[PDB]
Amino acid sequence: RYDVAKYGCPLTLELGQMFQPIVELYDENGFIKIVDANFILWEIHGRN
Amino acid sequence: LLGLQQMILSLTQSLGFETFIFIVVCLNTVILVAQTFTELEIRGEWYFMVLDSIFLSIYVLEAVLKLIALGLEYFYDPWNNLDFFIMVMAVLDFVLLQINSLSYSFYNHSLFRILKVFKSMRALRAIRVLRRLSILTSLHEVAGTLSGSLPSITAILTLMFTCLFLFSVVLRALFQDSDPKRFQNIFTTLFTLFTMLTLDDWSLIYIDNRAQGAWYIIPILMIYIVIQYFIFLNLVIAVLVDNFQMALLKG
């Protein structure tokens, strides 16, 4: 069961497009900086 | 005046057609070779299109005189049919410029280039109707012997078209999802086949296909290239050589 309270609003992307997952750092009052490190993405339950 | 008007038209057509048509089409080709001339149009552009329209009016008078003329046998000359088509396009573009207003794009659009190549057809027609005198008999005989073997060369170019279409079909079938950006559609596919057919950077095709992962397409390409190249050029060279050779065997 998907939802929004613990999974957020899903994306409504159309047919095949290019997306880069890019993330920024934020604390307390607001955002600090853009994040550059080394990521890993992974699915909740499992696909290939 | 029926047939009486037709015979008056024949005699006065001979006289006035000779005099007026020769002098005005000589002046038309003078202003038209002055027109193209992409250095002197900036020393112009205002005395050029007005004289162009004036001699287009002279040409529509030619077509009017031919329309009131003898008629059906006028249409039996292919050059006169070309006159009729050229004048249909000329009155079309003249009224298109004349009405103004419109709702489509302008200011040297593609349609303007279509009218410019129509003007080129008109210039070619002027050139062909000033050469009624002294085409020279030597090149007349050369062209007559050149045009003798028409069915052979038409058959050979038909075989060329069939072979080229087959090669384009099989290559585009074999070039799917194989960086087809150079030949993504039918026009570019046939143009690339023309480039392979005309010895143009097919070695470059080999060297930038070796950068890809497919290799057997390169032996396929060279074997198709060599068979079509050798067969077609040997066919045409031999056919035209013998075509002039039997005329050589005569006087």
Partner: protein, 48 residues
């Protein structure tokens, strides 16, 4: 962090049977034309 993607795909209806109907319609029309030509030729083969 969490984020989900819902991209629209390119899986349409197969429509194999919708055009198999056209296959059968054309096959029956061709068979009917063949039967009509058959009857015509049995009418016109006694002349030879």
């Amino acid at each position: 962090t969490i984020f989900a993607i819902e991209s629209l795909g390119m899986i349409p209806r197969s429509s194999v049977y919708l055009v198999a109907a056209l296959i059968f319609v054309l096959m029956l029309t061709f068979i009917s034309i063949l039967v009509l030509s058959y009857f015509w030729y049995l009418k016109i083969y006694r002349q030879f």
